[PDB]
Structures are given as C-alpha cells and as structure tokens.
Amino acid sequence: EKYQNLLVVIDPNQDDQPALRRAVYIVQRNGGRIKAFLPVYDLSYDMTTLLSPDERNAMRKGVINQKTAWIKQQARYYLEAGIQIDIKVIWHNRPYEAIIEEVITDKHDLLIKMAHQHLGSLIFTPLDWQLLRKCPAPVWMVKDKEWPEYGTIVVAANLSNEESYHDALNLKLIELTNDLSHRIQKDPDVHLLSAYPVAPINIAIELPDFDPNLYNNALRGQHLIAMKELRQKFSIPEEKTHVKEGLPEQVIPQVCEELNAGIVVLGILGRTGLSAAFLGNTAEQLIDHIKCDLLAIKPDGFTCPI
Amino acid sequence: EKYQNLLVVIDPNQDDQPALRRAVYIVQRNGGRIKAFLPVYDLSYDMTTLLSPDERNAMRKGVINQKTAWIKQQARYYLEAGIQIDIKVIWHNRPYEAIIEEVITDKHDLLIKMAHQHLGSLIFTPLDWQLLRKCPAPVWMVKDKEWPEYGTIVVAANLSNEESYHDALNLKLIELTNDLSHRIQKDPDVHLLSAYPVAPINIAIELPDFDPNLYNNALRGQHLIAMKELRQKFSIPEEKTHVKEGLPEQVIPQVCEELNAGIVVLGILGRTGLSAAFLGNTAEQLIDHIKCDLLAIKPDGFTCPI
C-alpha cells in the first residue's frame, strides 16, 4: 500500500476541480484517501482598528463555514460513491506555506493541483511556482484538459551533469514512475528521455589541437551509456528510450508532444550551488514550456525551506 | 535630470526587443543612456571532468562574443541614430541575481523587461516573478503589443490597510507617475484607482448588535476620504479618481481595461509580516491577471534579499 495519502489543493476560483477528479481516479484504482485542502483569509482580519477581535472572528468563521460547504458540494458525487474525502479549510494568509506545512505534518504521498492550459503550454501561477520549488513531496500539476488517449508517460533523466546525486535522482524518478503508473493503469506506456546541448564554438583560438565536435560526440556517448544502464535496470525497451540533441528546455517539451505524452516526470533540486544553479534555471524554463501534465520530484534528503 | 540610467533586460529567445524599444522611446524624450544587459552561460562550463578550464573558458568567451554581437545587431539603428546603448553580456548561471546585482551596483533608475501577451493577460516567467519580488528599483514590464492610442496611466493605491507605511508608498507611486509621465508624454492622462472587498457575512451569531453592512460603508468611506486627499495633493481631477467595490485582484485588472490603460502602477512590498502577507498574496494574483504594462514600485527602505 503506497501513495494512499493524497493531498488535493483546491482551486478557489472555479467550481469544477480537476485536481480532485484526478485524485479520485487514482483512489478508485489504488485505494486510499484524499484531503481536499484550501487555505482561506479575508481582508477584514487585518483591519484591526476598524473591527474588534470578535467581529473579525465572526467573519473568519463565516468564510470557513461557506468554503467548507462549497467544497462538499463539488465533492458530493464522489462522497456518495464512497470515496474518502476529508475536507480541510484553514485560516492562513500565505497559501504556499499553509500547503507545504500540511504536506510535512501529515506526510502526504503526493500533492495534486490543477493548472490551466488555454501557447498550448501550462499556465503556472506564483503559488504553483512556490510549490514546485519548495514542496518536499512529489507535485503533480494536472492540466485542465482531457488526458490524451493512449497517452505516454515520459521520464526526463539528467544524463549530462557529472555529480553523483543526479544518478540517484534519476533512479528515484523511474522507480516511482514504474510503481505509481502500474497501480493506476493496466498497461502503462513508459518512455525515457534525455537531451544534451552542443558546444557553442567551432574552434578554440588558444587550443590548436582541440576539436569541439569531439566534445559533442562524447556527451552523446555518455548519454547513450547511461541510458542503456537505466533501461536495463527498469526493464524499458530500447525503442522507448530517446537521447536527443538540443537545449533541454526546448527539446523535452517538443519530444513529449511528439510522443503523445500524458505526463512528463522530472527531477528538481533544492540545492543551488555549482552545477545546480544552471540546472535549476534550465528546469524552470523547461517546466514553463510544458504542454502536458507535470510530475516534479525532489531528491531524498531535500531540505525544505519551511 | 531624473530617470537617466536605464537597465534593459534583453530577452535571449527572440531577435526583436520590445524592452529596448521602450527604453529608446524614453531616452529620445527625456535623455539619458541604456544598458542592454544579458546574463549568459552554457552547460559545458559545469562539465569540469570532461573539459579542462582552458576548454571551458574558450566556450565561455565564444558565447559572450556571439551574444554581444547579436545584441549590437538588434541595436544597430538606435545606435546610428545616436542613442547611447551600452551592451553588457556577463557570464552568470542565475539571471535574477545577476540582474539585481547590476541594478544595485550601477544604481539604475528603472529596470525594463518585455512580457508576452498572446487569456489576454501578460505571461510572466519565473525570472519575471523573481524580479518583481526582489528588484529594489522600479520594474516596468512592457507587453509585446502596441501601446493603446490615448492609453491612460492608472495608479492603483492601497487605501484599505491601516499601517502608516501604505500612505507613504501611495505618495511615492503618484509622485513618480506624475514626474515620469510628464517627461515622456506631452499630456499624460493619469487616473487613480482603489478597490475594497465587502464583508463575507450577513450577521454575526455572537454579536446581536453588529451590522456587517456598516463595515462595508465605513471601508468605502475611508477610501473616499483618502482618495480625495491624494487627488488634491497631486492635482488629479475627481472624475479621474475611482473607488470600486470588489476583490482588488479582479477589480483592478477589469477597471484598467475599462479605462483603456496603457499601464498600471502598483506598490509591492518586501516585508511579509502581519497585513503584508495577505497584501502580497493579493498583489501577486492582481499582477498575474493584468492585461496592460505594469510598473511595480517598492517602498523607500525596501531591503533587498540580495
């Protein structure tokens, strides 16, 4: 029994809740329970001269009353169908903090939240970015569109960076993807994808014997060796592995489209030193251009700012 | 001579630079100079086992060479027209940090950066959000669309919050808006706008004598008094002042549209305690739904994280 304790971040701006729907879909197939969570507040609570503590608390309780009932209205059919949905509305003026505290305190297995897609790329709010960067648990951004028929599951591995922690994260991504996907789908179609950029020069004026093209070939070669190792460990067929040349923030979203991905699984770090800085920059631009669901996973030993 | 030292954040993803164009427009009318700034990097620099320091530095210099020339190509016509444009391309793997350091070190008067508009609302990248939150200087997000003919300039004042620092920021917003707008436009059309939300309850179960409607009337009354004070100090006609009921993150973008705004001027804080927390949340949602240019200004004594 894994992935039993799901957290759904309710979107207060519309009735329909694609994040709740996705969580229900998961629970129907894998069992468990769902916390439908929403941090709320009201300007009146900060009007401490104009209103008394009793008056402000009356308004606070009114908001919590109303929002709790509203969530139940949306969850009605799921509930009577017998899905366990615990509705939690709390008073808090900083939603990303409230949400992450909830993840940490109740040890939630997955955080699930909807993102709009009208560009074709997913629209991420400042709250979404905070969760992506800081939430220690896997974050599943669910696009508010139908899941593609025969949609694939694409894991984006980092096969370029030389630090040993990248390999550990890659393993964690695929282990989780294989496990979770088989709990949800009868026959998951899992692909592995890496991308490497080429040298930005043709020749080095200080280095007569250097050939930048050999660097390109070596980086590709490094990917090929690492990709084979991954596919064999996780029993993925060679034809479902893809090593692609180009900037990852362009290549990965494009190839996901070409592969008819329902979702891309990506590792994101908290650390910011050395190679992590450019990696984090690349990752944000990649995410910012994705056109399918995103499942973002942190390393074991991720230190949460909160 | 104010606003002479402009910083333009170049967008590396396309040739045309609406941020540079806007800066040129300003300089033609108000004088000064422009730094066309771009932090760049390359994966190869972090490949410290595969490549030697000399090989990595060859690639680094190649990138800086190429990007510097490319910016000059885009700036060509402005330059020969006699506009002072200093091109600065530097090696840095964390663009928001590089950019803010540049603002701090050279004491730039304004930071100008383009945002796309395909929703109708401006699209903000993670970099844009970092600059909006952390840059100490005013940040002008320039939408990549034509400036509306007879477009207005709308200042959004915070007339609800009770802390004294809000009034100071409101004054700073309008003083800057009046000054800058008259340096750029022959006859700027400046409007003032505030928005207040209503009580979320009809009656208080613990407080028989309380009437929440009186709170609504009082908050409106507070806005009316403060708005009159502002318009008289800054010689803005009453018909160009607007006190509107509703959630600011909905009302302000909507009214800007109704007023045919070319730009909205908004105060944003760094502090996060007490009333600042919900204020920052409201501000982010407001910005995230704006459909015209944004000029975001911080308080005097803003403490930059960097």
Sketch the domain layout of chain B as residue ranges: 1-306
Nearest alpha-carbon partner for A26 in A208, A263, A177, A184 = A184
What CA–CA distance (Å, rounded) separates B306 from B300?
16
What CA–CA distance (Å, rounded) separates B20 from B100?
18
Number of C-beta neighbours around residue A173 at 10 A: 25
Facing A278 at nearest CB: one of B43, B54, B218 = B43
HSE of B82, CA atoms in CB hemisphere, 13 A: 2
Say whether domain B1-306 belongs to CATH 3.40.50.12370. yes
In angstroms, what CA-CA distances link B255 with A42, A224, B227, B265?
22, 56, 16, 13
Query: Are A58 and B204 a contacting pair at CB < 8 A?
Result: yes
Nearest alpha-carbon partner for B7 in B131, B185, B188, B178 = B131
In angstroms, what CA-CA distances link B115 with A23, A171, B11, B127?
34, 37, 9, 11
The verdict on A200 touching B (C-beta cutoff 8 Å) is yes
The verdict on B213 touching A (C-beta cutoff 8 Å) is no
Q: Which of B121, B281, B285, B288 to mutate to test the interface with A (most CBs of A within 10 A)?
A: B281
Facing B93 at nearest CB: one of A93, A212, A281 = A281
Facing B204 at nearest CB: one of A55, A129, A222 = A55
Nearest alpha-carbon partner for B294 in B125, B138, B104, B126 = B138
Nearest alpha-carbon partner for A288 in A258, A259, A249 = A249
Please give the resolution of this entry in Å, rounded to 1 decimal.
1.8
Which residue of chain B comes nearest to A97, CA vs CA? B277
Which residue of chain B comes nearest to A129, CA vs CA? B126
Contact A43, B280 (CB under 8 A): no
Facing B288 at nearest CB: one of A45, A51, A126 = A126
Write down the experimental method used for this entry: X-ray
Structure tokens at B230: 């502002």
Query: Are B201 and A62 a contacting pair at CB < 8 A?
Result: yes
Nearest alpha-carbon partner for A168 in A271, A237, A238 = A271
> Exposure string (b/e) for A63-94, b if CB count within 10 Å is 16 or more?
bbeebbebbeebbeebeeeebebebebeebbb
Place of tokens 């030389």: A162
Nearest alpha-carbon partner for B302 in B136, B128, B129, B99 = B136
